[PDB]
């Protein structure tokens, strides 16, 4: 019916990845792949690999046809933040968050 | 509680609540405000009441 792929703990804030995710939500997978190929954003690379994985999952695991597949759901969730220190002036330290994201792509022929 | 009597930070100027002791009962790891001691719970019963 519907096939999933996820990239967990992707190194990018959810805010940045969601920009790209919004482009392909609802599209035919062929159109989606084109859109991602000509989006000049690091997130477009991340999302395209997940989408490609979802298509391969649908074909191999669920005997689906690539021609019929649409991106039926796509969402980005916040993953864990890695905490780092950034020295500032006058002996003060700031916290840096290295934000991560969980990218989920669901393709289906319906 | 184990720990020193050093004032954690100076009384004024830092913008923090004033602190005197790392062992304050307000603090995590601090003392218990009214720490129990071993107690004798026995009561007197008058012989005639027994």
């Amino acid at each position: 019916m519907e096939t999933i792929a996820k990239h967990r703990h992707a190194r990018s804030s959810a805010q940045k990845v969601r920009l790209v995710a919004d482009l392909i939500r609802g599209k035919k997978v062929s159109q989606a792949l084109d859109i991602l190929t000509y989006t000049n954003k690091k997130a477009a690379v991340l999302v395209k690999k997940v989408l490609e994985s979802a298509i391969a999952n649908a074909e191999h695991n669920d005997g689906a046809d690539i021609d019929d597949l649409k991106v039926t759901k796509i969402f980005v969730d916040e993953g864990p933040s890695m905490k780092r220190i950034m020295p500032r002036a006058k002996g003060r330290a700031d916290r840096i968050l290295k934000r991560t994201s969980h990218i989920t792509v669901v393709v289906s022929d319906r | 509680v184990t720990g020193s009597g050093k004032k954690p930070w100076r009384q004024k100027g830092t913008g923090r609540a004033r602190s005197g002791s790392i062992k304050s009962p307000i603090w995590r790891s601090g003392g218990v405000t009214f720490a129990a001691r071993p107690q004798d719970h026995s009561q007197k019963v008058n012989k005639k009441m027994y």
Partner: peptide, 16 residues
């Protein structure tokens, strides 16, 4: 007359 001293700095304290 002036009702305030001219602003001054505070001494450094371990920040966090």
């Amino acid at each position: 007359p002036p009702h305030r001293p001219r602003p001054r700095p505070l001494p450094w304290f371990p920040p966090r």
